[PDB]
Amino acid sequence: LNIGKKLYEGKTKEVYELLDSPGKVLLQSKDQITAGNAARKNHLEGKAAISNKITSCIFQLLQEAGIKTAFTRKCGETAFIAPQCEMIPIEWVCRRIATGSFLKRNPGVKEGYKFYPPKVELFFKDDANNDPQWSEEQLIAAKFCFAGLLIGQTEVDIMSHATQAIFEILEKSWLPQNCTLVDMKIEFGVDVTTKEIVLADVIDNDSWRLWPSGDRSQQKDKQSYRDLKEVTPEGLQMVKKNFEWVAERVELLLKSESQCRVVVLMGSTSDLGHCEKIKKACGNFGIPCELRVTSAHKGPDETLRIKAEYEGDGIPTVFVAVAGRSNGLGPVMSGNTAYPVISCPPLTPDWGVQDVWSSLRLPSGLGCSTVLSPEGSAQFAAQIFGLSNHLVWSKLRASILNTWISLKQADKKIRECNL
Amino acid sequence: LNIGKKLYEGKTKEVYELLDSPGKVLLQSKDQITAGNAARKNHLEGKAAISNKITSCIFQLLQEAGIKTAFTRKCGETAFIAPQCEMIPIEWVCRRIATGSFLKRNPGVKEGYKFYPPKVELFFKDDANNDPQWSEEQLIAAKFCFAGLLIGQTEVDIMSHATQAIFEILEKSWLPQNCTLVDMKIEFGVDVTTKEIVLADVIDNDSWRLWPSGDRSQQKDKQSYRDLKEVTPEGLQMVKKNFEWVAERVELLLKSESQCRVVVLMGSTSDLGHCEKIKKACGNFGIPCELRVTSAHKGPDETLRIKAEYEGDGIPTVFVAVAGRSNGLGPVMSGNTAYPVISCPPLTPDWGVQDVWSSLRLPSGLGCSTVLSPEGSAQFAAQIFGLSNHLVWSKLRASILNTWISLKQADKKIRECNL
Amino acid sequence: WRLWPSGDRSQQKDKQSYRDLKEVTPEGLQMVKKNFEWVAERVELLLKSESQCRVVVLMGSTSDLGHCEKIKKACGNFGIPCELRVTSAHKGPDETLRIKAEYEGDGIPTVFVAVAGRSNGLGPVMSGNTAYPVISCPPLTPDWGVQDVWSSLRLPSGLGCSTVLSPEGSAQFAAQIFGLSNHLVWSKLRASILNTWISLKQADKKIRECNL
Ligand SMILES: Nc1ncnc2c1ncn2[C@@H]1O[C@H](COP(=O)(O)OP(=O)(O)NP(=O)(O)O)[C@@H](O)[C@H]1O
Ligand SMILES: Nc1ncnc2c1ncn2[C@@H]1O[C@H](COP(=O)(O)OP(=O)(O)NP(=O)(O)O)[C@@H](O)[C@H]1O
Ligand SMILES: Nc1c(C(=O)N[C@@H](CC(=O)O)C(=O)O)ncn1[C@@H]1O[C@H](COP(=O)(O)O)[C@@H](O)[C@H]1O
Ligand SMILES: Nc1c(C(=O)N[C@@H](CC(=O)O)C(=O)O)ncn1[C@@H]1O[C@H](COP(=O)(O)O)[C@@H](O)[C@H]1O
Ligand SMILES: [Mg+2]
Ligand SMILES: [Mg+2]
Ligand SMILES: [Mg+2]
Ligand SMILES: [Mg+2]
């Protein structure tokens, strides 16, 4: 590992150039904890390893969901490799629950006020003035430029939407551990190579407020250190145990709590191309997808036996029925399983207007749903599993963001061809 | 409570007439455990309370799912009130896993062979000949008559289907406790008042095989007592602890592990009638259902804020979009949530052929599904929640049985109008 | 097997007659032999068609010949003779009735299949003037097929004319009709249900390998 010059150093991290890696840097954590802009600073042994472990797990989680993130890989106990960014000097905060500075700036609001949707705020980075709140209008008027990207209305709107999405993903991911994510702070930078705005810096135990069972008095985050009247050695051991508590649970956010499976049943091997599109699209949400050939019309006995194989092994299953012309496979399956059935018929413009009604108009006592897009039927199957699986949910959530970002970028492009 | 005369007494239960309660009886459990046809009999203190508690919990579970069952209520620690039945003298067994007598009657099959779907078998009740297996053809040819109901092809086909459905419901219900329901035995009788075939006798720790983590050596059922080489006082305490283990956990089968909610969003209060039908049908599955008024066309800002309230409180939610004419509410919602959205448009024959396409043909990146039936949209919502909620699943499964039974009954009726 | 003439076990012609003998005598073996000879004589009649079958495909235009060739080919698969005839109900209704009469009049059980594009009058006219079954199998394309099909489907009262869109399907339906009387046609239909089912099982087995 070919380490170059120390680029900068701050309160908790040293950033080094990597001579064998163009556009990449090494972020080495220090055994330092800090708070405020006064003398609250301490050595804390093992903090560097805890910060590194949390950020490395959280960045891998957000990256596997599809959030664009400045993270390459973990590099031992106390560092990580990242794409080099020109950091935007704004703290982006997201709140589910009103506490901390929100109450000070909004006297009359009580602790516990819930934000639907989560509240996003901006703070300009400046220790001299204790990080003052900025409006979107102030950030636009600053006309900041980083690695050649002017930070305008489009870029601010993107960081704002991304902050909400990142919060919701981390919020949903902590829920299975019976922890309430109250709020968080993140920072973005411009990747010096790609010129993309990406989540950067770290997300660690100083970034958020984490309340087991929603109970503030059980707070496990750095607020436990900020709240101390006086820092004693007995006080720092409590803080360290809180950081250890989070370090011991954070890797479980990468694990699937519940199993998911899509079974695509096709009446004919001529509709294989259409079923390959469903299977591929399921792969994008990390949901295993099996293809099976069975006809309701010509082998209804075999359809029910295949159904029984998937009903009988304890794995939650969504069936997707692909039947051309008069669809009996969706209906028959729908009538004989408690699991959901989606008809995704391979309609063409020739007879599709006529064929679709055999999926849509069903006798009473049948729940069978219809989705015409094959990518759509995978997404709907994912949305169903997202109710139980935070990993699938997070891919859906990040995909809503990324698609929205794509529209903003295409509008920005075509707007330049308006002069 | 006015107790009458003792009607019957067997190895483990006494049946008493209730003088104020026509067509109901009291089944009093005894502190007796037995095995085989031979001298394996023991007094075991608290067995009566454990048997009564298990059957009372299991019968309430099956009854609340919609399985027709001879159970009224628990009546203290050691008895229960039931509708009086003329018992059909057949033991109905269902197997997920090959063990016990299946291996003896099918040499070459290995322990652990899985049945898809679960295997149903009939045994005629006769201690003299160790309960010989009967075919369906033998039971039909017996021309049994109980409380005036001749047991024919229809009645046998009903008991056989009911046995599979009861087993699958109990199998699904034990899964969240990490217990494998291997197999079970049940008996049916004819309710002397209604003349309906109903599950009767008991389902207790003698009725099934229960393997924690699928591990036969951790068996918690009465097989632990059958297997003992010789019955010692130390041997009976181990059996008692197995029965106590089941007694403790059986009550958790009545508890919902996961929360469910349907939110029905309507573009106009003129579509209220249609939304009332969705809400009523959701009530049948025990799923709370909220009605909300919002227009994507006229109040899209408000649609997103309402969406956020239900996204934000940690409760798994299915949205049902009810918009007449050009449905924008399904699409908009679908594009802005990771939760499932179902369009259930209030189509009439006037313009329904034209309006439906606004739900069906969507831009890429939308998983929005379509269900035309309002009862159907609730059932689909139930099927989605049934992947996580064994109580919802069980109502869907019992509904498949009951619907099938009522077709058999209607066919039997119209067949009389053909002679 | 066990073979009972008139469903009468006491007339059993199979080897059960030999299994049942208390003791095997020379007189006992001659009775068994006669039972075997009875079956030997009659087994050859199982290969013979008891009833005659014919499909007549009437086409309004020789441009629909391709579509009629598919009906005739598919009829050949069931061992049913199939004749093609050209007649228009619109332009030669007198001739349509005379052609109908040739096939009504020679004692051979016949199913008529009417192939008329656009406004199908040939199915209806034929249906109204014969006691034999008529099937409309119109040569629909996606251009105007949604509009044309209704001329086969919505008929005045007193017409039994049926519709089958598939040309192979119209032959199979014709076969099913003859299968009520002809055990050879029936047996091809029955074996075809098996073979189709077997090939689904085989295709499912193949695609299951592409899932591990
Ligand atoms: N991917 C990245 N590429 C380049 N610089 C980065 C990246 N991630 C973080 N940094 C910078 O690394 C510097 C050192 O971090 P740290 O020691 O935590 O600083 P600090 O004292 O918190 N300073 P500041 O964040 O500016 O208030 C920070 O100033 C970040 O802007
Ligand atoms: N709902 C009911 N109504 C009437 N009788 C019932 C009902 N449920 C169970 N019984 C009968 O109650 C009797 C006493 O049960 P039990 O003490 O378990 O007898 P047993 O020794 O197991 N006899 P058996 O089931 O006939 O082999 C049995 O004969 C059952 O058929
Ligand atoms: N961690 C930080 C910081 C911040 O600068 N923190 C450090 C400075 C440093 O990390 O070196 C400190 O002084 O404690 N600013 C916001 N937040 C987080 O943002 C949400 C809202 O915080 P509020 O605005 O209510 O104080 C909560 O989760 C904080 O943890
Ligand atoms: N409990 C019984 C009985 C039965 O008669 N039980 C009692 C009779 C009595 O109450 O004295 C006993 O002797 O243990 N028959 C079937 N089963 C259950 O049904 C499935 C079939 O078991 P198999 O046929 O493999 O033994 C397994 O779950 C048994 O527990
Ligand atoms: Mg700050
Ligand atoms: Mg920092
Ligand atoms: Mg038994
Ligand atoms: Mg009993």
Side-chain angles (χ1 to χ4, degrees), chain A residues 266 272 279 290-293 298-299 301-302 305-306 350-351 354, chain C residues 140-142 145-146 193 196-197 200-201 203-204 207-208 210-211:
Chain A
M266 77 193 78
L272 178 62
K279 178 177 183 203
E290 295 186 40
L291 309 178
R292 300 300 297 273
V293 178
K298 303 189 288 210
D301 58 315
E302 186 57 3
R305 201 199 53 73
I306 294 166
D350 283 344
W351 299 105
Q354 288 74 47
Chain C
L140 302 182
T141 76
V146 174
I193 290 168
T196 298
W197 182 87
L200 287 157
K201 296 283 303 186
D204 183 49
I207 205 149
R208 271 202 315 266
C210 320
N211 273 338

Coordinates of all heavy atoms in Angstrom, one line a residue, chain A residues 266 272 279 290-293 298-299 301-302 305-306 350-351 354, chain C residues 140-142 145-146 193 196-197 200-201 203-204 207-208 210-211:
Chain A
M266 N -44.8 -19.8 -16.6 CA -45.1 -19.5 -18.0 C -45.9 -20.7 -18.7 O -45.4 -21.8 -18.4 CB -43.9 -19.1 -18.9 CG -43.0 -20.3 -19.3 SD -41.4 -19.8 -19.9 CE -40.6 -19.4 -18.4
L272 N -40.5 -17.2 -23.1 CA -39.3 -17.2 -22.3 C -38.6 -15.9 -22.3 O -38.1 -15.4 -21.2 CB -38.3 -18.3 -22.9 CG -37.0 -18.4 -22.2 CD1 -37.2 -18.8 -20.7 CD2 -36.1 -19.4 -22.9
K279 N -37.0 -11.9 -14.6 CA -35.9 -12.6 -13.7 C -34.7 -11.6 -13.6 O -34.2 -11.5 -12.5 CB -35.4 -13.9 -14.4 CG -34.3 -14.6 -13.6 CD -33.9 -15.9 -14.2 CE -32.9 -16.6 -13.4 NZ -32.1 -17.5 -14.2
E290 N -37.1 -17.9 -9.9 CA -37.2 -19.1 -10.6 C -38.2 -19.1 -11.8 O -39.3 -18.5 -11.5 CB -37.5 -20.2 -9.6 CG -36.4 -20.4 -8.6 CD -36.7 -21.5 -7.7 OE1 -37.1 -22.6 -8.1 OE2 -36.3 -21.3 -6.5
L291 N -37.9 -19.7 -12.9 CA -38.8 -19.9 -14.1 C -39.3 -21.4 -14.0 O -38.5 -22.3 -13.7 CB -38.0 -19.6 -15.4 CG -37.3 -18.3 -15.4 CD1 -36.6 -18.1 -16.8 CD2 -38.3 -17.1 -15.2
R292 N -40.5 -21.6 -14.3 CA -41.2 -22.9 -14.4 C -42.2 -22.9 -15.6 O -42.7 -21.8 -15.8 CB -41.9 -23.3 -13.1 CG -41.0 -23.3 -11.8 CD -39.8 -24.3 -12.0 NE -40.4 -25.7 -12.1 CZ -40.7 -26.5 -11.0 NH1 -40.4 -26.1 -9.8 NH2 -41.3 -27.6 -11.3
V293 N -42.4 -24.0 -16.2 CA -43.3 -24.1 -17.4 C -44.4 -25.0 -16.9 O -44.2 -26.1 -16.5 CB -42.6 -24.7 -18.6 CG1 -43.6 -24.9 -19.8 CG2 -41.4 -23.9 -19.1
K298 N -53.8 -27.2 -20.0 CA -53.3 -28.5 -20.6 C -52.7 -29.4 -19.5 O -52.5 -30.5 -19.7 CB -52.4 -28.3 -21.7 CG -53.0 -27.4 -22.9 CD -52.2 -27.3 -24.2 CE -51.0 -26.4 -24.0 NZ -50.7 -25.8 -25.3
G299 N -52.4 -28.8 -18.3 CA -51.8 -29.6 -17.2 C -52.1 -28.9 -15.9 O -51.2 -28.6 -15.1
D301 N -53.4 -30.2 -13.1 CA -52.9 -31.1 -12.1 C -51.4 -30.7 -11.8 O -51.1 -30.6 -10.6 CB -53.1 -32.6 -12.5 CG -52.3 -32.9 -13.8 OD1 -52.5 -32.1 -14.8 OD2 -51.7 -34.0 -13.9
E302 N -50.6 -30.5 -12.8 CA -49.2 -30.2 -12.6 C -49.0 -28.8 -12.1 O -48.1 -28.6 -11.3 CB -48.5 -30.4 -14.0 CG -46.9 -30.2 -13.9 CD -46.2 -31.2 -12.9 OE1 -46.9 -32.1 -12.3 OE2 -45.0 -31.0 -12.8
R305 N -49.5 -29.0 -8.3 CA -48.3 -29.7 -7.7 C -47.1 -28.8 -7.6 O -46.5 -28.7 -6.5 CB -48.0 -31.0 -8.4 CG -47.3 -32.1 -7.6 CD -46.6 -33.2 -8.4 NE -45.7 -32.6 -9.4 CZ -44.5 -32.0 -9.2 NH1 -44.0 -31.9 -8.0 NH2 -43.8 -31.5 -10.3
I306 N -46.8 -28.0 -8.7 CA -45.7 -27.0 -8.7 C -46.0 -25.9 -7.6 O -45.1 -25.6 -6.9 CB -45.5 -26.5 -10.1 CG1 -45.0 -27.6 -11.0 CG2 -44.5 -25.3 -10.1 CD1 -45.0 -27.2 -12.5
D350 N -51.1 -6.4 -31.5 CA -52.0 -7.2 -32.5 C -53.3 -7.5 -31.8 O -54.4 -7.2 -32.3 CB -51.2 -8.4 -33.0 CG -50.2 -8.1 -34.1 OD1 -50.2 -6.9 -34.7 OD2 -49.3 -8.9 -34.4
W351 N -53.3 -8.2 -30.6 CA -54.5 -8.7 -29.9 C -54.5 -8.3 -28.4 O -55.3 -8.9 -27.7 CB -54.5 -10.2 -30.1 CG -54.6 -10.6 -31.5 CD1 -53.6 -11.2 -32.3 CD2 -55.8 -10.6 -32.4 NE1 -54.1 -11.4 -33.6 CE2 -55.4 -11.1 -33.6 CE3 -57.1 -10.2 -32.2 CZ2 -56.4 -11.2 -34.7 CZ3 -58.0 -10.3 -33.2 CH2 -57.6 -10.8 -34.4
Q354 N -57.5 -7.1 -26.6 CA -58.5 -8.2 -26.4 C -58.1 -9.1 -25.3 O -59.0 -9.4 -24.4 CB -58.8 -8.9 -27.8 CG -59.5 -8.1 -28.8 CD -58.7 -7.0 -29.4 OE1 -57.6 -7.2 -29.9 NE2 -59.3 -5.8 -29.5
Chain C
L140 N -58.9 -14.4 -40.0 CA -58.7 -13.1 -39.3 C -57.2 -12.8 -39.3 O -56.4 -13.7 -39.0 CB -59.2 -13.2 -37.8 CG -60.7 -13.6 -37.7 CD1 -61.0 -13.7 -36.2 CD2 -61.6 -12.7 -38.5
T141 N -56.9 -11.5 -39.6 CA -55.6 -10.9 -39.3 C -55.8 -9.8 -38.3 O -56.9 -9.4 -38.1 CB -55.0 -10.4 -40.7 OG1 -55.7 -9.2 -41.1 CG2 -55.1 -11.5 -41.8
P142 N -54.7 -9.2 -37.7 CA -54.9 -8.2 -36.7 C -55.4 -6.8 -37.2 O -55.9 -6.0 -36.5 CB -53.4 -8.0 -36.1 CG -52.8 -9.3 -36.5 CD -53.3 -9.7 -37.8
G145 N -59.6 -8.0 -37.9 CA -60.1 -9.3 -37.3 C -61.0 -9.0 -36.1 O -62.0 -9.7 -36.0
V146 N -60.7 -8.0 -35.3 CA -61.6 -7.6 -34.2 C -63.0 -7.2 -34.7 O -64.0 -7.3 -34.0 CB -60.9 -6.4 -33.4 CG1 -61.9 -5.8 -32.4 CG2 -59.6 -6.7 -32.8
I193 N -53.6 -35.6 -25.8 CA -53.7 -35.0 -24.5 C -52.5 -35.5 -23.7 O -51.8 -34.7 -23.0 CB -55.0 -35.3 -23.8 CG1 -56.1 -34.5 -24.6 CG2 -55.0 -35.0 -22.4 CD1 -57.6 -34.9 -24.2
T196 N -48.9 -34.1 -25.2 CA -48.8 -32.6 -24.9 C -48.5 -32.4 -23.4 O -47.6 -31.5 -23.1 CB -50.2 -31.9 -25.2 OG1 -50.4 -32.1 -26.6 CG2 -50.2 -30.5 -24.8
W197 N -49.1 -33.1 -22.5 CA -48.8 -33.1 -21.1 C -47.4 -33.5 -20.8 O -46.7 -32.9 -20.1 CB -49.8 -34.0 -20.4 CG -49.7 -33.9 -18.9 CD1 -50.3 -33.1 -18.0 CD2 -48.9 -34.8 -18.1 NE1 -49.9 -33.3 -16.7 CE2 -49.0 -34.4 -16.7 CE3 -48.1 -35.9 -18.3 CZ2 -48.4 -35.0 -15.7 CZ3 -47.5 -36.6 -17.3 CH2 -47.6 -36.1 -16.0
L200 N -44.8 -30.8 -21.8 CA -44.8 -29.7 -20.7 C -43.9 -30.2 -19.5 O -43.0 -29.4 -19.1 CB -46.2 -29.3 -20.1 CG -47.0 -28.5 -21.1 CD1 -48.5 -28.6 -20.8 CD2 -46.6 -27.0 -21.1
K201 N -44.1 -31.4 -19.0 CA -43.2 -32.0 -18.0 C -41.8 -32.0 -18.4 O -40.9 -31.6 -17.6 CB -43.6 -33.5 -17.7 CG -45.0 -33.7 -17.1 CD -45.1 -33.4 -15.6 CE -44.1 -34.1 -14.7 NZ -44.4 -33.9 -13.3
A203 N -40.3 -30.0 -20.8 CA -39.8 -28.5 -20.9 C -39.6 -28.0 -19.5 O -38.7 -27.2 -19.3 CB -40.8 -27.7 -21.7
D204 N -40.4 -28.3 -18.5 CA -40.3 -27.8 -17.1 C -39.0 -28.4 -16.6 O -38.2 -27.6 -16.0 CB -41.5 -28.1 -16.2 CG -41.4 -27.6 -14.8 OD1 -41.1 -26.3 -14.7 OD2 -41.6 -28.3 -13.8
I207 N -35.9 -26.4 -18.2 CA -35.8 -25.0 -17.7 C -35.4 -25.0 -16.2 O -34.8 -24.1 -15.8 CB -37.1 -24.2 -18.0 CG1 -36.8 -22.7 -18.1 CG2 -38.1 -24.6 -16.9 CD1 -37.7 -22.1 -19.0
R208 N -35.8 -26.0 -15.4 CA -35.5 -26.2 -14.0 C -33.9 -26.3 -13.8 O -33.4 -25.9 -12.8 CB -36.1 -27.5 -13.4 CG -37.4 -27.3 -12.8 CD -37.8 -28.4 -11.8 NE -37.4 -29.8 -12.2 CZ -38.2 -30.7 -12.8 NH1 -39.5 -30.4 -13.2 NH2 -37.8 -31.9 -13.0
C210 N -31.7 -24.7 -15.6 CA -31.3 -23.3 -15.8 C -31.8 -22.4 -14.6 O -31.9 -21.2 -14.8 CB -31.9 -22.7 -17.1 SG -31.9 -23.8 -18.5
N211 N -31.9 -23.1 -13.4 CA -32.4 -22.3 -12.2 C -31.5 -22.6 -11.0 O -31.7 -21.9 -10.0 CB -33.7 -22.8 -11.7 CG -35.0 -22.2 -12.3 OD1 -34.9 -21.1 -12.8 ND2 -36.1 -22.9 -12.2

